[PDB]
Design a protein around this ligand. Sequence first.
Ligand SMILES: [Mg+2]
Ligand SMILES: [Mg+2]
Ligand SMILES: [Mg+2]
Ligand SMILES: [Mg+2]
Ligand SMILES: [Mg+2]
Ligand SMILES: [Mg+2]
Ligand SMILES: [Mg+2]
Ligand SMILES: [Mg+2]
Ligand SMILES: [Mg+2]
Ligand SMILES: [Mg+2]
Ligand SMILES: [Mg+2]
Ligand SMILES: [Mg+2]
Ligand SMILES: [Mg+2]
Ligand SMILES: [Mg+2]
Ligand SMILES: [Mg+2]
Ligand SMILES: [Mg+2]
Ligand SMILES: [Mg+2]
Ligand SMILES: [Mg+2]
Ligand SMILES: [Mg+2]
Ligand SMILES: [Mg+2]
Ligand SMILES: [Mg+2]
Ligand SMILES: [Mg+2]
Ligand SMILES: [Mg+2]
Ligand SMILES: [Mg+2]
Ligand SMILES: [Mg+2]
Ligand SMILES: [Mg+2]
Ligand SMILES: [Mg+2]
Lengths: 67, 107, 223, 96, 45
Amino acid sequence: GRVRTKTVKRASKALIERYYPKLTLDFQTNKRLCDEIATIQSKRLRNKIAGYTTHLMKRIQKGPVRG
Amino acid sequence: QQQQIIKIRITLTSTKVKQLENVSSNIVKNAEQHNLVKKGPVRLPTKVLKISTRKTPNGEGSKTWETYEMRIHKRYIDLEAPVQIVKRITQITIEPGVDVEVVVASN
Amino acid sequence: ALISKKRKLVADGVFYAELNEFFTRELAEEGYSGVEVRVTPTKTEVIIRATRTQDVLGENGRRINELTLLVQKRFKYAPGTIVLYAERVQDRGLSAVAQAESMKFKLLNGLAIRRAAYGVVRYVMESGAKGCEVVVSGKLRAARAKAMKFADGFLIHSGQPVNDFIDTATRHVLMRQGVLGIKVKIMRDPAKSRTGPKALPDAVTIIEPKEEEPILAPSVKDY
Amino acid sequence: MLMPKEDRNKIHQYLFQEGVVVAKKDFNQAKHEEIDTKNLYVIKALQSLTSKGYVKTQFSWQYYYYTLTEEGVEYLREYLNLPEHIVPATYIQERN
Amino acid sequence: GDDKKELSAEKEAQADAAAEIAEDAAEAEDALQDYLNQQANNQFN
RNA sequence: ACGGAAGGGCACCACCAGGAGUGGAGCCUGCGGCUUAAUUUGACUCAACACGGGGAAACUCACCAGGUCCAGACACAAUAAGGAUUGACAGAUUGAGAGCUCUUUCUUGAUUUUGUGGGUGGUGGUGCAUGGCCGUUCUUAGUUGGUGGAGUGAUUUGUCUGCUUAAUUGCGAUAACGAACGAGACCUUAACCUACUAAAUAGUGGUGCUAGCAUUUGCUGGUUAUCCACUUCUUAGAGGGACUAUCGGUUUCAAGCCGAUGGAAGUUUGAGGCAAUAACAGGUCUGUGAUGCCCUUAGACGUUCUGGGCCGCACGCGCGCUACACUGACGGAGCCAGCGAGUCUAACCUUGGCCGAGAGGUCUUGGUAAUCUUGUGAAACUCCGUCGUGCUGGGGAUAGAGCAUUGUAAUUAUUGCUCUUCAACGAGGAAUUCCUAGUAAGCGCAAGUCAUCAGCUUGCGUUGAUUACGUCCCUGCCCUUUGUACACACC
Ligand SMILES: [Mg+2]
Ligand SMILES: [Mg+2]
Ligand SMILES: [Mg+2]
Ligand SMILES: [Mg+2]
Ligand SMILES: [Mg+2]
Ligand SMILES: [Mg+2]
Ligand SMILES: [Mg+2]
Ligand SMILES: [Mg+2]
Ligand SMILES: [Mg+2]
Ligand SMILES: [Mg+2]
Ligand SMILES: [Mg+2]
Ligand SMILES: [Mg+2]
Ligand SMILES: [Mg+2]
Ligand SMILES: [Mg+2]
Ligand SMILES: [Mg+2]
Ligand SMILES: [Mg+2]
Ligand SMILES: [Mg+2]
Ligand SMILES: [Mg+2]
Ligand SMILES: [Mg+2]
Ligand SMILES: [Mg+2]
Ligand SMILES: [Mg+2]
Ligand SMILES: [Mg+2]
Ligand SMILES: [Mg+2]
Ligand SMILES: [Mg+2]
Ligand SMILES: [Mg+2]
Ligand SMILES: [Mg+2]
Ligand SMILES: [Mg+2]
């Protein structure tokens, strides 16, 4: 399965919460954004995160999301 | 009044790469950092000592096997330098964990 | 000499291992806590990290002399090619082995089981630990064997940070009715690591945004 | 044990010099390194010396670590007759 | 140890750690026979 | 906590759909049993039975037939320098060139010897006294606290109908909100870098020196430095890469799931390491100079030395190897891996040359190793033949005779070679094991053990499928609900 743990989903929340201007529908830049904008300890955990914070981003465009 | 190019070979061997590469790149710079003539670190295949054993002290149970391993990392850097720098470069640059070997010779 | 590199590195480990043993036996009542062996030209150097280094020494050098001689005569060194140096440790309170051997000692002056361990926890904690945990297994006074957990603060138990952050030690305290085992587990604050990762692989710090006063119709400043 | 005084002397002598003895747990060697008798003679010699309080014994990895103790430092001072203010490796070497 | 006297444990335990901090604070400052061995047979030779 | 109720799930140590089989046979090998001087012993459902790294010729070794020795600390006492005690040649004796014991009569000199006390060793007992380690529950998903809610209270809710996931993994529902352990993360290995830093211990192109065939320039080789240049292939440092991306279906348009495109890679990327709380009278005192208590301690249960034994054979059980042939056997010929390992105070890995049918021998040699063995020219496999369905040239058990190697020793045959002898077995009853992709199966190799001995194991690469991509029917487990007079918890 590919269900993202809370730590990923939690962190994505926190970042969209306070950096919606900046951030994009693009993972590739959301990646780089995460580096400047947050400390993470492993490349894997970062993309795992930024990929999902892109997901959440990509569908706020099409209506609100609880949380 | 002394000196003379002696054609040297430093071999570095260890199990801890950060220290090993500490002493490695430290050496290479601190040689061209005053203009010698070398062939940069040659990393030989890192080699792996395995030991494969049953965990049990006795015999009971499904037979769980378990492999310990020890990695050996060996480098060598070739230097052409006078008698002085050699010893200066051998005595210091030492490090708990890295084994330095200096040989000379045409062959 | 003339030894295969393979043989030589394995060789060296065993050496550390026999050495470490020997000291752990000889220097228990001085809080021996580990060694390191620095090989140099002209000398093999052995630093003894023990907590009570005045005793490790002896009257103007008595005991470390004996020890060297000992260390020397065994591995067949040449009087001078071997060198011993004691050296107190920065805070024993974050050294597994230190606290195991403390209990051993505590329990041998016969403190109440819980009183022993519970203080050992509450000192490690005091010594700035990010978590600690003690097990006592074996038999006391009753016949049937028991076991206890004594733990406080934060530990983690899996994967690489284990290698990184938790120190452990088992020691076997030998008593009259039987022999019981101590297990100490200190975990050090990763925020201070000095040389490694400075946090759990789990840590995800988000930087706090600055509040800005936007608006203001264009404008431009000359320099 | 059963061993001539000659070998007892060498032992006690060597012990008073070094102030330390080591010896592999393996009887049947017949020649100690360093000392000049049977391995068996050493191990049991000091064993006595120990169990009458004069020396500490330590084992670990098959190898016997004997430390001369102060009370012993008196005894063999007698056995070797040498005067008080003699020795045992209890000098600080040169400027070492 | 009796669960019925736990508090009395944690307390003496506390004090134990306290006096351990004492011994480790007073460590932040706290407070010949010659002739030689081989040589006394080289002299008496 | 438990049930012989009830509702849900999860899994090739479950079935489905299949593969390859074991179960039948010959032998190898463990266990029983029987036999024996002894045939040492542990372990008996998954979780004892090619397990104790357990492949025992001495050793190992614990067992049996015998023979020495004390290595019986230390303390007191006794004997005692008119000698406490130690040793011995020859003979006898003995398996023995053991002064074991005896004859005889020297020697040694306070180290012993006798006694009591006290120690000490012990593969003696006890794993139902213990430590430690391990295995099992567990191919599992569970454990806890702050603030709030309920309760006099132990407690509870949070931690839940559903949905989802490998996962108390999430979505969602919601008197809960927001967190920590364990899962994830993390680490290791296999995959991608013509981007970065390099290399005579790795290799390519050019150039010399040079061989062969063609010649029209060509083609194919030789040359541990005759020179120049590079880093694609090899090596390992630092980075980068993937996040199930883009798009599209499906869904409480929620977590997700499915399909297509692209991609080194899109089954947790594949495979591992780590691994919470708790449980078991699981196994181990036969790994330990870890250990309590018990036993024994000189005609020893200490130890060593000689010889036998663990291999014994009407028979029952388990893991295995090799086969019953033609998708084959045999013979010639092609000819390709990867993980490994190797000698200092030593005899390890071995090239090349000779001699030998072979096994092997002998003379030299390279290597403490990306340098030499070794391109480990491995085996299946590929090709051209021979044999032709006949127990046949499938099969190779049993047995005779000879050579040789390891070793002090090979008889009860260590192993290897040669000729001969040529069994059972014509695909296996009831039953039962394992498994979903570079996997199954076939095939050999290195490593552990190791003087010599792999039909075992740990890894490794070579050749390379059929069939699911499901379900709860069997079996095993987990979960709620529910009953309890159980809580030492259905033993
Ligand atoms: Mg965690
Ligand atoms: Mg994990
Ligand atoms: Mg089936
Ligand atoms: Mg079948
Ligand atoms: Mg024997
Ligand atoms: Mg006695
Ligand atoms: Mg007695
Ligand atoms: Mg024992
Ligand atoms: Mg048990
Ligand atoms: Mg146990
Ligand atoms: Mg038993
Ligand atoms: Mg499975
Ligand atoms: Mg209340
Ligand atoms: Mg619940
Ligand atoms: Mg490259
Ligand atoms: Mg495609
Ligand atoms: Mg039992
Ligand atoms: Mg044990
Ligand atoms: Mg056997
Ligand atoms: Mg088995
Ligand atoms: Mg011949
Ligand atoms: Mg040579
Ligand atoms: Mg035939
Ligand atoms: Mg045949
Ligand atoms: Mg082998
Ligand atoms: Mg075996
Ligand atoms: Mg109830």
